[PDB]
């Protein structure tokens, strides 16, 4: 058998605004759940 | 304070794993 290239490959993007929104969401989720993780 | 011994590692991983995922995706964008 041959190893053929797949034509369904598509690039993934995450823009800077999406990066900032995700980083803020992750930071505030850490802020929210850290007190419960420490208990 | 007598906190959970896993609280620090859970907090750092809970913050840092999706932070890393987002940074990976942002930096490769435009390729």
């Amino acid at each position: 058998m041959d190893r053929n290239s797949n034509p369904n490959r598509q690039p993934v993007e995450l823009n800077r605004t999406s990066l900032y929104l995700g980083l803020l969401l992750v930071a505030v989720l850490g802020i929210l759940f850290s007190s419960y993780f420490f208990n | 304070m007598q906190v959970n011994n896993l609280g620090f590692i859970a907090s750092i991983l809970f913050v840092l794993v999706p932070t890393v995922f987002l940074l990976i995706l942002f930096i490769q964008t435009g390729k």
């Binding site: 900032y20 803020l24 930071a27 420490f38 | 620090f8």
Partner: peptide, 30 residues
């Protein structure tokens, strides 16, 4: 030592706020 973790996560949120204001993608009319 949990105080360090709380300070770090609050600092990460505030740094994200600074970099999102100061270094946003500029809105461009095109």
């Amino acid at each position: 030592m949990e105080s360090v973790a709380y300070i770090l996560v609050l600092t990460m949120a505030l740094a994200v706020l600074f970099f999102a204001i100061a270094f946003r993608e500029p809105p461009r009319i095109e």
